[PDB]
């Protein structure tokens, strides 16, 4: 009885179940499908999959790709022409050193998300943005802030620094390049000089953090912030008259860049049943009626674009798809572990007339460049 067994997550269990019966009378084999808790399956996939105990399939984090793939535990996926049909940026972030390792079924990226009842039709460049800020903190005066977003916190600021062409580790045909570091260059520079005009001009505050911009928007003291699919809900239960767009165009022709987490599904090196696994994964899967399927079970920023396509009724999707699709995938290499606190200290120094943008930058990287070493 040849089988293939499924780590997926709860919303996915029915669909999987259905597919795989598919899958048993195409080709006769038997699909066995488990829930189990994205965390355990990191850990318990790390574990059992070297002792031929892995589940054939798995679930994940677009982050897992880089030790997984290194330590030769996820296969290769090879090239299909239904991929054309993917986000690039949800392929890139399963792929690792030139190649491509699970089938992306969910993205997530922060947008603009705006109070209609004080922006009733969202900015399309940051100047435009600046200009709606100020009339709010400067008619309102200060009990609603125009604009909030986590002033010092790098994944909240990526997506000026990506926009005008900084990088965390530089994106090559062969793979992430770790010693080419772009997080000082001119348009990295550029990113943040952004971010201390923002400052600078009164429409962001040093103190700036998550909770802040979070409470303030939810609680009706906020037109316009940056955040992602997570706190849509809270803000509806609210009562907040909420739209979602994408992050206004750094300048014409520029947009923000946001960081991209993706979530996939992987296939076991080890498993005996490899081939069919990745048939199942490749001409059951990924299909476009499948993950339209897993988008209705789960609604998460799909990674196909004829998806979208098929969903697009709701705004919301679109604004926040429309994001992640420019977006850059947090990278999936180890490394990226010693980036963010350094960052987020440049970020802080800055922000507190502490460093100048250049010269924290330039410090961070050197960290950065040290810790990698």
Known sequence: QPKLTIWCSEKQVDILQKLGEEFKAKYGVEVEVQYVNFQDIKSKFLTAAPEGQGADIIVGAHDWVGELAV???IEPIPNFSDLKNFYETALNAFSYGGKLYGIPYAMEAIALIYNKDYVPEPPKTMDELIEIAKQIDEEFGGEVRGFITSAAEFYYIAPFIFGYGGYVFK???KGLDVNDIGLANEGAIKGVKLLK???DEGILDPSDNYQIMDSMFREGQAAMIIN????????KDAGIDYGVAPIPDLEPGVPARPFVGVQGFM???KSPNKLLAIEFLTSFI?????????????PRLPSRKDVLELVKDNPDVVGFTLSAANGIPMPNVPQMAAVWAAMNDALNLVVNGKATVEEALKNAVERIKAQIQ
Do not use: F, H, S
Request: net charge positive.
């Open 197 to 199: 005009r923002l400052v």
């Open 171 to 173: 994106q090559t045909e």
């Open 267 to 269: 296939v076991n090196a």
């Open 286 to 298: 990924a299909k476009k009626e499948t993950m339209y399927r897993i988008y209705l079970g789960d």
């Open 228 to 235: 992602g699919p997570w706190a849509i809900k809270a803000y």
């Open 71 to 73: 330590n030769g535990l």
